[PDB]
Design a protein around this nucleic acid. Structure first.
Ligand SMILES: Nc1nc2c([nH]c(=O)n2[C@H]2C[C@H](O)[C@@H](COP(=O)(O)OP(=O)(O)OP(=O)(O)O)O2)c(=O)[nH]1
Ligand SMILES: [Mg+2]
Ligand SMILES: [Mg+2]
Ligand code: NA
Length: 329
DNA sequence: CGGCCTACG
DNA sequence: CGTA
DNA sequence: GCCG
């Protein structure tokens, strides 16, 4: 009994079907590059089902009945099991379009629509973009400037150092405010593309205006290479992280939430991306409730659920609780 | 057939 | 659009 | 692409 929504089953970080899931994820990414979010989602959901299975799939038979496996995903698996390669996957992954779209969308500040326009204009390399700086937003200029460092995996030692400097700035900005590591590192990942932190204060309302004060204190300590900055509560930053004898750029996301919303923000920002999309879809389509990073809303009674923990949210949705390390959908 | 997560910057 |  |  494989449940159909990813939020209904545990997905560990280490799983048993990486060859098959990787192939489906290439097809998902290619679907996104061609503007089909629906096909992207199906291929991601199928890949995720494989990550939740207890053992390796060795025979096509083992897919029977699994949700999100239809004719196309099944054929991909069948070719991989019988030949060790899937022609369609190889054609996609070796194509100029796929490789260029992947290169460009991996830049901070560049998504599919921007990458597709550049591709249609004949651009193919990072050097091509550097030569045409007037095509770039300031966010994209920062992403390109720091691209090599941003392609280096962030490690747990980096997380620990960043948490210390963020806690220092937060404490200087508002006594009693707290910093919680979220994102993939909270799910047990050993590396990441960035570090995500959620900031609050135990007294509702005290955190208003906090994030500009934090950003100013980090900027004055020379720690900020790029940020968007009158009020704001999320910052998608690039930090200058000291290293032995030098420094490296690291993407850091900072989000401030009132404490009433903390469990919802913690749940949302802990991910994974697919886990949260599936949880929000489940909430609305199966329970008639609207979930976001601020709350859980009953649109008929026009009321918000008062959760004290992530556990409370799962319970109000009729779901078995999953700890962060089982949300790796 | 239409849906496919979410809200902030 | 970007965060993604 | 798959599903409700
Ligand atoms: N990347 C991404 N995150 C999303 C989306 N929707 C959504 O609610 N989120 C939430 C869940 C993610 O765990 C959380 C933090 O995002 P992230 O991009 O830093 O990803 P991550 O920490 O899980 O993984 P990573 O940084 O190692 O790559 O944001 C979405 O479409 N993409
Ligand atoms: Mg992250
Ligand atoms: Mg992030
Ligand atoms: Na990008």
């Amino acid at each position: 009994w494989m449940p159909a929504y990813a939020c209904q089953r545990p997905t560990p970080l280490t799983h048993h079907n990486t060859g098959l899931s990787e192939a489906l994820e290439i097809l998902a990414e290619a679907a996104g590059f061609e503007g089909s979010e629906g096909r992207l989602l199906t291929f991601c959901r199928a890949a995720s089902v494989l990550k939740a299975l207890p053992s390796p799939v060795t025979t096509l038979s083992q897919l029977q009945g699994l949700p999100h496996f239809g004719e196309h995903s099944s054929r991909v698996v069948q070719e991989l099991l019988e030949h060790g390669v899937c022609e369609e996957v190889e054609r996609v992954r070796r194509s100029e379009r796929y490789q260029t779209m992947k290169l460009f969308t991996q830049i901070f500040g560049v998504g599919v629509k921007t990458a597709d326009r550049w591709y249609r204009e004949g651009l193919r390399t990072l050097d091509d973009l550097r030569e045409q700086p007037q095509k770039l937003t300031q966010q994209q200029k920062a992403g390109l400037q720091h691209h090599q460092d941003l392609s280096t995996p962030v490690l747990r030692s980096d997380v620990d150092a960043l948490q210390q400097v963020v806690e220092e700035a937060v404490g200087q900005a508002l006594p009693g405010a707290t910093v919680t590591l979220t994102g993939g590192f909270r799910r047990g990942k050993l590396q990441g593309h960035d570090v995500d932190f959620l900031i609050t204060h135990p007294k509702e309302g005290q955190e208003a205006g906090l994030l500009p004060r934090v950003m100013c204190r980090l900027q004055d300590q020379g720690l900020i290479l790029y940020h968007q900055h009158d009020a704001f509560e999320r910052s998608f930053c690039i930090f200058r992280l000291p290293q032995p004898g030098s420094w490296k750029a690291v993407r850091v996301d900072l989000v401030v939430a009132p404490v009433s919303q903390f469990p919802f923000a913690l749940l949302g920002w802990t991910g994974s991306d697919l886990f949260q999309r599936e949880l929000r879809r489940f909430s609305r389509k199966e329970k008639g409730l609207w979930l976001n990073s601020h709350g859980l809303f009953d649109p008929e009674q026009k009321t918000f659920f008062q959760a004290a923990s992530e556990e409370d949210i799962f319970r109000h949705l009729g779901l078995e609780y999953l700890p962060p390390e089982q949300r790796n959908a």
